[PDB]
Design a protein around this ligand. Structure first.
Ligand SMILES: Nc1nc2c(ncn2[C@@H]2O[C@H](COP(=O)(O)OP(=O)(O)OP(=O)(O)O)[C@@H](O)[C@H]2O)c(=O)[nH]1
Ligand SMILES: Nc1nc2c(ncn2[C@@H]2O[C@H](COP(=O)(O)OP(=O)(O)O)[C@@H](O)[C@H]2O)c(=O)[nH]1
Ligand SMILES: Nc1nc2c(ncn2[C@@H]2O[C@H](COP(=O)(O)OP(=O)(O)O)[C@@H](O)[C@H]2O)c(=O)[nH]1
Ligand SMILES: [Mg+2]
Lengths: 50, 35, 82, 436, 146, 49, 426, 64, 426
């Protein structure tokens, strides 16, 4: 029983780690999109100002 | 080999830059300042 | 093809192990930082009720530092308050 | 798309007696050989082609032969309630018993009747046009089913060869038993069953007794209930050919998805939902729970613990209103479940089929009418555990040369006893090797 | 939401099991004739039509005559509810046909015309079981069932 | 007899949880690598900015 | 004029093709009797592409049923719009594949391939201007994978100058229906890289979760499942069958979509997709269509495109729209998410428009993508192959008719080559 | 012939993956060592203020 | 052009928003089937601030309901006008916050905010010009406080330059429905003092008193209170949807009301609020409305202005009146109640007029005051917090879920320094 409880608690710990990692994945994707949009905007601004 | 051991000392440095003495101090000071 | 597969597997394994070790070390340092910032804020918290007397002089009216007498100034301030 | 069924021995003939009444109830055939003039339940004409062949003006006959040396059971069938159903030439009755002797059933009286049996089967197959396979029904624990069954299997194999052979074989229980020479008869039959029959479906007696005690809540069951539920399993297996569904198989997908190795073919059977009429209307029946029920060790038809073994491949037939979704979901859940473990030979070991026909219940039966059902046929190593258990008692009884005088008087010798012993031992060796 | 969290699909719709229990094995059979001699090839042909009282579904079977010019095909139309009406189809989702849209057991009157997917069948005979069921339930007289 | 049956079931449950935790380990490693690659992409994009 | 000849191989292929012919016949306006009842003349002028008028306007589809199952024959005949196909075209064997690629490609094929080829040659010379071949079939079966592949090899030998669309469903372990899927796949995909001109790869789990969240269906049977596939297949010939402001045939699609001869593995999707209960609440516009189509959850493959980069992509629009907004939206979905494209090919996206939306809607679109993410699925099935081959399991059934181990190892070699080159170009 | 170019194409493919994989591992390591350097700088900043304000009387940087 | 996204949190916020949407839909004259049936054409030129046209006259609100129980959704759809909301916007939990701020901000947030944020992102991208967000919630419940604060923090983070109107109803000891109201309110305001841009503070006690004294209803239900709040929360934004002789939008109101970047808690009130018995016996002129507007009993909060001073006060008049008359009325109020107004700010009153009054009435007024008396409620709740927190009562339910002890001390530090800042400028 002690081994089983230890292994199970390891299990939900790893699960919550994975879930937090997935949340980070989504946040990084959103950052990617917004940053690329700003890249395009600043490139156009550079051409116009030059 | 060489790169592996280099990374090992790098990690040891970057994780023991601060002393366990200072960690215990931080905990004790936190308790004392709470009271 | 065997050489190619062995090389790629070795590169993947080295990347994986570096990522795991670095993540563990970074978690340890983040845990170290979490306690520190709590100490800084709670010190800021108790200072609200302090009088400006001890705000200006919280201590009094050349070797290294030992770990037993390490909190004498804080104990002096605590005794003043008590 | 027809198959041919042969029944040998008391157990085989009784199981077939159940199977054929179940079939005629499914297809709406009256027990006197023809379908009625007004009541028309037939879901599709020619749907009986697999089992019944119409003869001229409204008289269907089965694609089956019953044969046994004992005349008692055969004449009981002749004088029973299904008199006109069978063709009076399929019923082969001998004169005197095999009397629990493999040598007697295979050598002395064996030679006399096998030629007539194979001659009748030849005419049956010639009348048939799309013959798919053979369905043999026997118990190896007796004399007739072991000897005559093995001899007929060997001769049919050397005659036809390529066609698949499904042998639904009843084996002795670890505790329940009715004869004494059953270890001898079983190993002697197995020595040839292993290398002739394509797929051997395991069946026990004590396991089914416990099943009908636990689910149907009958405390004192008989052979009739056992044969009825075996017939239900066979009907569920052949429904893929008999009826139409959204995802179906035939007799060849079994031998293709279920036999990874030429000498590893021993199938565990299971069926759900076994529920009585009292609890049928109160309990909730759907794919998730029927699939879960079809996997607990107390719900398989042979006494052997699947937990000790690791599955090779599982084939799941669904009958009735079943959609691909809930079966796929149940499959995902049963795969992620840990109490059962798969071996690494086959990462994808599920073969699913769906058919639109709901199960039928015979009038006066102990099973209530339900919307759907599932039947499972699986591979494991608990079968090898069973073989080791049987071989232990075989060698222990043989060490004292008990009962060998009957065999040597019939005309056989200890050589094939030694050969069967070493063959079975090699078989457990093969299972324990593949289990790695 | 219940389907999201896990719920029996048949219990989602409900009101299914009473009808199956009440009429598990009740089928109405009709002998239809399809007249299409106005088209270029082929002639008028008889078929049979099964109406399953378990699900109110229709299945049209084709009867083959010996030495005919037609490929033997046991079934002519799959067992399903017959639309009985035209519905504006969608390329993504096939129409879901409800009971008031589909045919009912009381629709067949032994002398009318059924618009089965454009085909105009004329049913002209029915089994004695079907006649007895009609007289018992729909209060039909003997003359109508003739 | 009861102790033996419970013990056998309990070993089986231990094996179940063990390999489930192993699968969780592998999933965590894959998530870590994907996080690293997206982070690299983010740094390239902010460099362009 | 331009003719697409359509073959249905295997149970899955036949059942998908039945729905495809249903959809196309409904679009072109004929009732299941086989007579024309359409309203506008736009349906008649291009009716020759798929149908042939015999006598009395009794249009007959140019389709070729190929299997070993009289049961599937009865199913096709029983399904609505099932009697239109030709009894002459009902070419079927009697034995049964029994889920074996070796049986489907060597033993029974050796006798039935002659009949299937001379029939297909019959319609090939019946039509005036042959445009291409399309074959709908599975990949894990015996009579769908092996027999279809052998037919593909023979047709490629016969007509080396024709486009080939193969609509093939590829398995997944999560939704597994049989045991020898890795073997059947490896063989069929080993042959299709040389033989097939391009392949629209599909799977069952992607369609499942699409009807889960997009369509919000409760009980998604195969009748619901194959409908999206049929819609995509009908959409891919919108330019051929209907007028537009930018025409694009199969060859035009392929040239803009295939930079190297062995990269012709396309993943497909359809828009708009929405549930019935929220139709009235949702707007219809090109930006919304583009945002729906470029999402991973609208794709019909179990390959997350964010794990790779698109080599190239194409859009087939339908309905009265604005070319300027179409081009601007393609530019936006190429510029904002630029990291998910390839840098040495400018203008990764090719767009085209047609003048006729499908019936029951007002504006539609089909997305086709040659993206590198499919190497994940190929790696998955290659691992399935290796695990079973590592002690030759289920292999005596294959070797029992003439198979050897050389072709088995060559198939794995070629799969390694495909996945290696995808990872190379990432 | 076909397997001849596949042999050399494999050589070109092998050359390509050598360059891509080696540079990718270097870049991520440089990134994360810079990040851990920033974090340890922050920690050293945190250590200094606690000593200097509360109870230090002295503070001393390490070598590096 | 300018756009306000709407979000409803918790049971209280959900019902308040449900009534508010009915009110605004009736004001714009749309049928509860989503179609247009009104008469004054001026309604539909500025419905894009709140509505999206779906298909031929069908309009959908730009709102998102969010909570963790199905009962609220069932009630709002069962109620009238409940058929106008888009079903895709119904982000919805399953387990319930259990009146627990830790559940609302750390347990179910981590699993549901990712879902609720993408939909609001899509809704914000749907419009061109973002003006702000409108979050309706309470400060005593679990999901009303924790989920609301977490969502507003995320929204502030991802749109750093947009306005936020948070209608927060606060607990009062005399009207208490739960036991941990201070534990929830302090933690929620701890985040509202940084993230939100303007918090309309409300409580049920003042609403009951208004319904009893001036309205003289016998048994008022929650519906009447929600309808009473709807008047002010709709009149605040009438300047966007209708023309006026002196317009003032959200940012203009904010920059005038807020002198310092922390003091953004405003009390609100509406005029007239007259019993139907006395409707005929009173005159409706701007001088008459000023008395009921500045009456301390008319404020929507249990905070007496006479125990403090006003910093700024804004007057949103609706209807056609005299700008000079409005200005002189406000001047007279400021001169007479000179001590009640702060000294170092001349002209503590901002005024603006919109030409379209609410239907039925030809004249109406809305008052928004940022007085320094509002610290009374914060003292009121902070004393309760300290009383419960000295003994650590009920503290396990929060400590065993993810926060620690010092968070509550931090929240009290912020509360105490906020009331200190009010007292400082008083
Ligand atoms: N399940 C089931 N088992 C049966 C039935 N009838 C017989 N058996 C079993 O079959 C086993 C062997 O059959 P036998 O009783 O020896 O009859 P036999 O196989 O014809 O052999 P002989 O006695 O030589 O004729 C018996 O031990 C029974 O347990 C039956 O109806 N149902
Ligand atoms: N989408 C779809 N897939 C199907 C259908 N029928 C069968 N399949 C798929 O076909 C795969 C197996 O193909 P198989 O039946 O062996 O083809 P066969 O060679 O004709 O027997 C399974 O994984 C099923 O998912 C169908 O109607 N629709
Ligand atoms: N105005 C109004 N206030 C309400 C209503 N229902 C509850 N409240 C207030 O909301 C507080 C409880 O908050 P609650 O909705 O339970 O928070 P939640 O459980 O986290 O959603 C109580 O103090 C009530 O005064 C309502 O219908 N109208
Ligand atoms: Mg006997």
């Amino acid at each position: 029983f002690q081994k089983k409880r230890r292994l199970e608690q390891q299990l939900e710990g790893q699960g919550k780690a994975i879930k937090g990692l997935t949340s980070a994945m989504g946040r990084l994707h959103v950052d990617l999109t917004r940053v690329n949009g700003l890249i395009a905007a600043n490139s156009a601004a550079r051409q116009a100002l030059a | 080999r060489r790169a592996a051991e280099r990374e090992q000392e790098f990690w040891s440095r970057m994780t023991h830059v601060i002393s366990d003495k200072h960690t215990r101090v931080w905990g004790a000071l936190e308790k004392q300042l709470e009271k | 093809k065997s050489s190619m597969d062995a090389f790629r597997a070795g590169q993947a394994e080295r990347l994986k192990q570096l990522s795991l070790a670095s993540s563990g070390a970074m978690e340890t340092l983040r845990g170290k930082l979490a306690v520190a910032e709590n100490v800084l804020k709670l010190a800021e918290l108790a200072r609200k009720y302090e009088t400006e007397q001890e705000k200006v002089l919280p201590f009094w009216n050349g070797s290294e530092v030992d770990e037993w007498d390490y909190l004498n100034c804080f104990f002096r301030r605590y005794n003043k308050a008590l | 798309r027809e198959v041919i069924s042969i029944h040998i021995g008391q157990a085989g003939i009784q199981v077939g007696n159940a199977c054929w009444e179940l079939y005629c109830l499914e297809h709406g055939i009256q027990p006197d050989g023809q379908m009625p003039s007004d009541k028309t339940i037939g879901g599709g004409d020619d749907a009986f082609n697999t089992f019944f062949s119409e003869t001229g003006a409204g008289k269907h006959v089965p694609r089956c032969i019953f044969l046994d040396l004992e005349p008692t059971v055969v004449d009981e069938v002749r004088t029973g309630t299904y008199r006109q159903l069978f063709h009076p030439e399929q019923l082969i009755s001998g004169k005197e018993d095999a009397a629990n002797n493999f040598a007697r059933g295979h050598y002395t009286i064996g030679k006399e009747i096998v030629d007539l049996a194979l001659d009748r089967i030849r005419k049956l197959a010639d009348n048939c046009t799309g013959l798919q396979g053979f369905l043999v029904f026997n118990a190896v624990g007796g004399g007739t089913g072991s000897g005559l069954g093995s001899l007929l299997l060997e001769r049919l194999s050397v005659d036809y060869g390529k066609k698949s052979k499904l042998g639904f074989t009843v084996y002795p229980s670890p505790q329940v038993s009715t004869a004494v020479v059953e270890p001898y008869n079983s190993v002697l039959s197995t020595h040839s069953l292993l290398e002739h029959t394509d797929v051997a479906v395991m069946l026990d007696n004590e396991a089914i007794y416990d099943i009908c005690r636990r689910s149907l809540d009958i405390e004192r069951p008989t052979y009739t209930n056992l044969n009825r539920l075996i017939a239900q399993v066979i009907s569920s297996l052949t429904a893929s050919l008999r009826f139409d569904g959204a995802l179906n198989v035939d007799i060849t997908e079994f031998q293709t998805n279920l036999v990874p190795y030429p000498r590893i073919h021993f199938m565990l059977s299971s069926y759900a939902p076994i529920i009585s009429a009292e609890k049928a209307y109160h309990e909730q029946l759907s794919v998730a729970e029927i699939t879960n029920a079809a996997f607990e060790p107390a719900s398989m038809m042979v006494k052997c613990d699947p937990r000790h073994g690791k599955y090779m491949a599982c084939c799941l037939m669904y009958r009735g209103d079943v959609v691909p979704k809930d079966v796929n979901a149940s499959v995902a859940t049963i795969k992620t479940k840990r109490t059962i473990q798969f071996v690494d030979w086959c990462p994808t070991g599920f073969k699913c089929g769906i058919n639109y026909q709901p199960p039928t219940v015979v009038p006066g039966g102990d099973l209530a009418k339900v919307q759907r059902a599932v039947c499972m046929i699986s591979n494991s190593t608990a079968i090898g555990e069973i073989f080791s258990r049987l071989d232990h008692k075989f060698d222990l009884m043989y060490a004292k040369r008990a009962f060998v005088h009957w065999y040597v008087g019939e005309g056989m010798e200890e050589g094939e006893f030694s050969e069967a012993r070493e063959d079975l031992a090699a078989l457990e060796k093969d299972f324990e090797e593949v289990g790695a | 939401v219940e389907a999201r969290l896990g719920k029996p699909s048949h219990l989602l719709d409900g009101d299914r099991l009473r009808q199956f229990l009440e009429n598990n094995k009740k089928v109405l059979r009709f002998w239809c004739v399809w007249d299409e001699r106005t088209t270029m090839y082929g002639d008028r042909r008889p078929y049979v039509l099964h109406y399953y009282l378990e699900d109110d579904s229709v299945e049209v079977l084709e009867i083959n005559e010996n030495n005919s010019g037609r490929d033997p095909f046991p079934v002519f139309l799959k067992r399903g509810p017959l639309p009985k009406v035209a519905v504006k189809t969608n390329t993504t989702l096939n129409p879901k046909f409800r009971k008031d849209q589909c045919y009912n057991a009381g629709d067949f009157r032994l002398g009318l015309f059924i618009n089965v997917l454009g085909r105009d069948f004329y049913l002209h005979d029915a089994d004695t079981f079907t006649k007895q069921w009609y007289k018992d339930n729909l209060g039909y007289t003997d003359e109508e069932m003739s | 007899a009861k102790l033996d049956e419970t013990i056998s079931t309990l070993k089986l449950e231990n094996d179940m949880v063990s390999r489930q935790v192993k699968g969780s380990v592998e999933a965590r490693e894959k998530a870590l690598v994907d996080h690293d690659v997206l982070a690299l992409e983010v740094k390239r994009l902010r460099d362009i900015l | 004029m331009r003719e697409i000849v359509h073959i249905q191989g295997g149970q899955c292929g036949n059942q998908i093709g039945a729905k495809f012919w249903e959809v196309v016949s409904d679009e072109h306006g004929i009732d299941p009797t086989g007579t024309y009842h359409g309203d506008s003349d736009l349906q008649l002028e291009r009716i020759n592409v798929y149908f042939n008028e015999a006598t009395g306007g009794r249009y007959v589809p140019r389709a070729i049923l190929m299997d070993l199952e009289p049961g599937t024959m009865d199913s096709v005949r029983s399904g609505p719009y099932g009697q239109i196909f030709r009894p002459d075209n009902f070419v079927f064997g009697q034995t049964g594949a029994g889920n074996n690629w070796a049986k489907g490609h060597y033993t029974e094929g050796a006798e039935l391939i002659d009949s299937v080829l001379d029939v297909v040659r019959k319609e090939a010379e019946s039509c005036d201007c042959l445009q291409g071949f399309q074959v709908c079939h599975s990949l894990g079966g015996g009579t769908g994978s092996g027999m279809g592949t052998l037919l593909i090899s023979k047709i490629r030998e016969e007509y080396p100058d024709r486009m080939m669309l193969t609509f093939s469903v590829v398995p997944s372990p999560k939704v597994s229906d049989t045991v020898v899927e890795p073997y059947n796949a490896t063989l069929s995909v080993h042959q299709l890289v040389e033989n097939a001109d391009e392949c629209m790869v599909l799977d069952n789990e992607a369609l499942y979760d699409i009807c889960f969240r997009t369509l919000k269906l409760t009980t998604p049977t195969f009748g619901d499942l194959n409908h999206l596939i049929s819609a995509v297949m009908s959409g891919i010939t919108c330019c051929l069958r209907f007028p537009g402001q930018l025409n694009a045939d199969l060859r035009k699609l392929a040239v803009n979509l295939i930079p190297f001869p062995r990269l012709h593995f396309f993943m497909v999707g359809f828009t708009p997709l929405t549930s019935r209960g929220s139709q009235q609440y949702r707007a219809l516009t090109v930006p919304e269509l583009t945002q729906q189509m470029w999402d991973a959850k609208n794709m019909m493959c179990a390959a997350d495109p964010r794990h790779g980069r698109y080599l190239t992509a194409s859009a087939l629009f339908r309905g009265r729209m604005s070319t300027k907004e179409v081009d601007e939206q393609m530019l936006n979905v190429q510029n904002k998410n630029s990291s998910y494209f390839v840098e040495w090919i400018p203008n990764n996206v090719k767009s085209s428009v047609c003048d006729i939306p499908p019936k029951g809607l007002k504006m539609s679109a089909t997305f086709i993508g040659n993206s590198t993410a499919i190497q994940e699925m190929f790696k998955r099935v290659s691992e399935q192959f290796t695990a079973m081959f590592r002690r030759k399991a289920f292999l005596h059934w294959y070797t029992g008719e003439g198979m050897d181990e050389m072709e088995f190892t060559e198939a794995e070699s070629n799969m390694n080559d495909l996945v290696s080159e995808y990872q190379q170009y990432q | 012939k076909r397997i001849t170019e596949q042999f050399k194409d494999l050589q070109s493919k092998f050359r390509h993956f050598e360059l891509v994989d080696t540079k990718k591992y270097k870049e991520v390591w440089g990134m994360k060592e810079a990040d851990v350097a920033a974090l340890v700088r922050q920690l050293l900043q945190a250590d200094k203020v606690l000593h200097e304000q509360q109870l230090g009387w002295d503070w001393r940087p390490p070598d590096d």
